[PDB]
A paper describes a structure:
High-resolution crystal structures determined using synchrotron radiation are central to our understanding of haem-protein function. This is a particular concern for haem proteins, which can occupy a wide range of redox states and are exquisitely sensitive to becoming reduced by solvated electrons generated from interactions of X-rays with water molecules in the crystal.
A further high-resolution crystal structure was determined using a second dose of 0.99 MGy (an accumulated dose of 1.98 MGy) to a resolution of 1.49 Å. One O atom is ligated to the haem Fe at adistances of 2.3 and 2.1 Å in monomers A and B, respectively, as well as making a polar interaction with the distal pocket residue Arg369. Therefore, we conclude from the structure and the spectroscopic data that the haem is in a six-coordinate ferrous state with an O atom bound (oxy­ferrous). For the present crystal the 0.99 MGy initial structure has two molecules in the crystallo­graphic asymmetric unit, denoted here as A and B, and has been determined to 1.45 Å resolution. See Table 2 for crystallographic data-collection statistics and refinement details and Table 3 for geometrical values for the haem site of the oxyferrous DtpA structure. The structures allowed the assignment of 100 K spectra to either a diatomic (oxygen) or monatomic (compound III) state, while the spectra allowed X-ray and ligand-soaking effects to be precisely monitored.
Numbering used by the authors:
A (entry chain B): 69 to 272, 280 to 444
B (entry chain A): 70 to 271, 280 to 444
The structure:
Amino acid sequence: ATPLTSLGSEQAMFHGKHQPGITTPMQARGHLVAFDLAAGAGRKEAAALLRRWSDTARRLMAGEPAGSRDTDVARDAGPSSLTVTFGFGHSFFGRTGLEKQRPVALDPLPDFSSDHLDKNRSNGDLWVQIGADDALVAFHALRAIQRDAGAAARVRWQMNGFNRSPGATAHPMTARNLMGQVDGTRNPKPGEADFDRRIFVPEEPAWMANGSYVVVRRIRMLLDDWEELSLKAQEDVIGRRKSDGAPLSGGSGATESTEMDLEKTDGSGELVVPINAHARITRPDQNGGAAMVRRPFSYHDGFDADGVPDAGLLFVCWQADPLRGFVPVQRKLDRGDALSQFIRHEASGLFAVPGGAAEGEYVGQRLLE
Amino acid sequence: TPLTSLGSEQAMFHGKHQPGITTPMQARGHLVAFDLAAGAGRKEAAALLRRWSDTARRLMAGEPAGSRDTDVARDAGPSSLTVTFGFGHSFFGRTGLEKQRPVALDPLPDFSSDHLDKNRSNGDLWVQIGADDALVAFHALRAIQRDAGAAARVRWQMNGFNRSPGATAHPMTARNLMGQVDGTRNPKPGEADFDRRIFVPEPAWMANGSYVVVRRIRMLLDDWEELSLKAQEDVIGRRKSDGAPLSGGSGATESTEMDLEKTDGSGELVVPINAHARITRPDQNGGAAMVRRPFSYHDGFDADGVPDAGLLFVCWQADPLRGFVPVQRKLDRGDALSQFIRHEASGLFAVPGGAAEGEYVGQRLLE
Ligand code: HEM
Ligand code: HEM
């Protein structure tokens, strides 16, 4: 029996080889935030900020207050699987005299023909991902991180998301998105032999050892168009069934885990999994081994005047090198994916997320020290 | 209590009262107002409430929509979903139903501290959706909104959240984003004068209904969070740690009765004369009373770093003139809290009784 109290009592490690929020289980609530350094904040002020943030992270992730004038918003809750994760944008390095430690991996993402990016709501010197299974726990953490920045950095952009709660389903299972698709079946997983090679910078620039690169994309779903489609049309866009996430190449006996048959054909000769289906064309074996861990939140921020919902996927993917991950896959998807017609990339960020802090350290200490 | 309870718990659609009034607080909420379109009158409104009621019914039972289901809620339990419908003052002019417009829908006062967005206030129709799962909740919002079709547009829509089930070691009263214990003195079904306070007794189309007042109240968290603990506790008159009255001792808890006469060693009132939890009490307002059942909100930051965060205050009464209205008249300038909040949207809606088996909500008004 998993008790209901597990939701609050579950606690994620702050200290580790890798920062939390990469391999950590899906969380019900997320807040993504980007900060820009203030005028006259340099390396010294940035190192002080990351220390403040790390100390706050450590405390919050253990269910402990953020000091004397902790707001009490999270009081009485357990840690609720809170994680906080920190990253650095391309622009950070020229603000802090660290241009020589700027990884080539932060070179700007391509200008994809399908981009509709609000550049104000994109990019940033610093990125923080907050997730938890309790909304007060999560808001408390966002507010504490944001208040820790004080005058040394300002909020550039901030987005809210959500996922399925623990216990919503009779047994734990892969999540859904606002298209109604099963979302997360084929991620690389820890324990696979190539998982670290795919996802993390190895231990032997040196400050990124055991770090990863995240790509964030605010992707609006065109639900008004999507929801006029037949099931057959929606399933053809993905290549997997809405009911259980099994490949279209599968039988009634097929389930989520049954391997895709990418050569299966109709009586009529036509491929059962379409040639431009999203879950065909995104696979590492269709992309020279290009791979990523996808760990998103869904979003809904309202309706415009014509009733169009501002709803979609806060796409967050993780990779050792964007050029072997996000970038070549997106390059194919831009025009080549059946899904493109139904989505709109409306904001983006690429951040270097270092390894976990050890005892007595702050996140990014190797970089700033 | 197993973790699957989150999903498996089911609120009832059919009943004397609509769900979402006395129902326990939910982790996720969506509030939406609609305006009728040109060419939607009473017959179009009745069809709309029939559609909506059927969707509410299915969805509250954990079933897919009747048709064109999106699969977004598939695999999930009912997750305590509730759907609640009301009618605004303007509705009755739109549908030739002015003779059935309740007195109780007459416009709220223009409070001196109002800073109301007229475009995100009021509305012909209001729907309140809440659940403990966010995909269950979004799926319901989207289904209700798609039922509107040609009959009605979305006028405004706000998202809200609360504590999750299981977040605490055992069930406790809610907190808000000011970090206060919030809901201690909310009246409950078995308390003495509850029905008279909250429900129209069995125009007649409102029988067993209730009037809801919605206020989008921003919390001026930048100013609030620079106050000392002592100053914050003086604003409310209860402690943040445990929600006890300031008049309570070391052993006092949230439920301990407040002592409104108690003074300190220097003859000053221990619960301040303008504390919020003093001045809002029924016994300070001629018996005025309400059920409060809010959601917190956070919609991001403005350009200058100020959070668009606060309380989606939702309160329930048999008559606003014996609930929200006289209390808010008192609070407007008198309340220590008012300095750290701003009211930025408002709605007042008539929420009829719940649907019987094989009925739609609002049927006795719209037929
Ligand atoms: C809102 C936008 C998107 C939606 C709705 C969507 C939906 C899905 C779905 C339903 C699956 C199949 C189940 C699974 O394995 O998770 C999937 C797989 C995948 N998607 Fe997406 N996706 C979106 C955007 C992206 C983008 C922008 C990328 C990368 C540039 C991407 C990369 C992948 C990858 C790599 C897989 C796994 C392929 C495999 O190995 O089977 N997706 N996506
Ligand atoms: C952001 C706005 C507000 C906040 C933060 C707030 C907070 C609180 C808190 C902490 C309590 C004490 C605990 C409890 O009994 O629930 C309380 C009680 C109460 N508040 Fe509010 N409140 C707000 C707005 C309002 C408004 C607008 C009204 C009505 C006009 C209202 C009416 C009440 C009532 C009737 C009580 C219970 C009094 C009693 O009988 O003990 N509040 N509020």
